[PDB]
Design an enzyme around this catalytic site. Sequence first.
Site, short mmCIF file in Angstrom:
data_model
loop_
_atom_site.label_atom_id
_atom_site.label_comp_id
_atom_site.label_asym_id
_atom_site.label_seq_id
_atom_site.Cartn_x
_atom_site.Cartn_y
_atom_site.Cartn_z
N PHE A 102 0.85 -1.17 0.00
CA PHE A 102 0.00 0.00 0.00
C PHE A 102 0.90 1.23 0.00
CE2 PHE A 102 -4.25 -1.68 0.73
CZ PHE A 102 -3.93 -3.01 0.90
N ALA A 103 0.66 2.13 -0.95
CA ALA A 103 1.47 3.31 -1.10
C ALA A 103 0.53 4.48 -1.26
CB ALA A 103 2.39 3.17 -2.30
N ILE A 104 0.25 5.13 -0.14
CA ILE A 104 -0.69 6.24 -0.05
C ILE A 104 0.03 7.56 0.21
CG2 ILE A 104 -2.75 7.07 1.18
CD1 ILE A 104 -3.15 4.38 -0.27
N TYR A 107 3.92 8.21 0.52
CA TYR A 107 4.56 6.90 0.47
C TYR A 107 4.74 6.38 -0.96
CZ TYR A 107 4.68 6.39 5.52
OH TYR A 107 4.98 6.54 6.86
N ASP A 158 5.22 -3.71 3.95
CA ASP A 158 5.23 -2.25 3.89
C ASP A 158 6.14 -1.77 2.73
OD1 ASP A 158 3.56 -1.98 6.14
OD2 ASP A 158 5.16 -1.64 7.50
N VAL A 159 5.82 -0.60 2.21
CA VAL A 159 6.48 -0.06 1.03
C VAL A 159 7.77 0.72 1.34
CG1 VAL A 159 5.27 2.18 0.88
CG2 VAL A 159 6.01 1.00 -1.22
N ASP A 160 7.88 1.28 2.55
CA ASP A 160 9.04 2.10 2.93
C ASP A 160 10.21 1.24 3.40
OD1 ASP A 160 8.18 3.32 6.24
OD2 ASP A 160 7.33 1.61 5.20
N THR A 180 5.01 -5.45 23.22
CA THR A 180 4.01 -4.38 23.18
C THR A 180 2.67 -4.85 22.61
OG1 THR A 180 4.87 -3.51 21.07
CG2 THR A 180 5.68 -2.54 23.09
N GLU A 228 -1.20 -4.36 13.73
CA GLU A 228 -0.16 -5.22 14.28
C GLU A 228 -0.56 -5.89 15.58
OE1 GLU A 228 4.19 -4.46 13.93
OE2 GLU A 228 3.97 -3.80 16.01
#
Length: 276
Positions: free
Chosen positions: A60-62, A65, A143-145, A177, A235
């Site tokens: 996903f690249a919004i 991003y 994730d894209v980053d 966490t 997550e």
Amino acid sequence: FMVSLPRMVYPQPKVLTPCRKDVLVVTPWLAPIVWEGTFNIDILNEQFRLQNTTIGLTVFAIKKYVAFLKLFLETAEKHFMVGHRVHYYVFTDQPAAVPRVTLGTGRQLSVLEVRVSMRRMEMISDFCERRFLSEVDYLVCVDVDMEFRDHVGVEILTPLFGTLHPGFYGSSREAFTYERRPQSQAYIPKDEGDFYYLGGFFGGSVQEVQRLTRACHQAMMVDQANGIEAVWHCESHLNKYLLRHKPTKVLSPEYLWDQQLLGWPAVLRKLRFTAV
């Protein structure tokens, strides 16, 4: 069915010599934990090529991003499932900003327009449901980053996998966490938990990935209706799901690392997929 492997010459596995003595390589439910040194990629490549395996990779690249797509896709071309059929699915609000990246043979890219917190789980479950079943055997959701720096191949493929978060692989479960409020569907108490898995790298067969994403989407909707948002969003829900539905492989932190935050520890022989 599955045809015979061909004759292959490789070093004999030695029963009284572990591959890796410094790390856990199998979970207590007998799922492999994938580290460098645990697999012969030639055997695995043969097994998966003989099934004509197609792997879907979703990102996903919004908004801003979309800037990460070029490096992500170029490095995926060098490192991700090379030799196998790959179908990239790029979900974006800016189809025109998707870079024109040159792909190897047997690899294709689809741009899917969207448009929040639930969008990923929703899009993977019951918007692209039928399409994924028709087009690929496995889905890998990342994730894209990020950028690929080393081999990420068929050693990850299995009905359902999660990836050890690079910040928590050495931690006691009390320090994980997880969502700790009983009012959330993602709640895990202090005496439960195997591992802390990443939202940014999971996958499996299309059917198992759709089950996971459907379950998470439903749990997130319940939380929303109850006015609670889990501490780490999807997550947290992914962690609850994988606690109650054990993954059939777990990827070591080789598969999602942040070198700037965490360096390059001796236990990591390769850094395969990393934060930009």
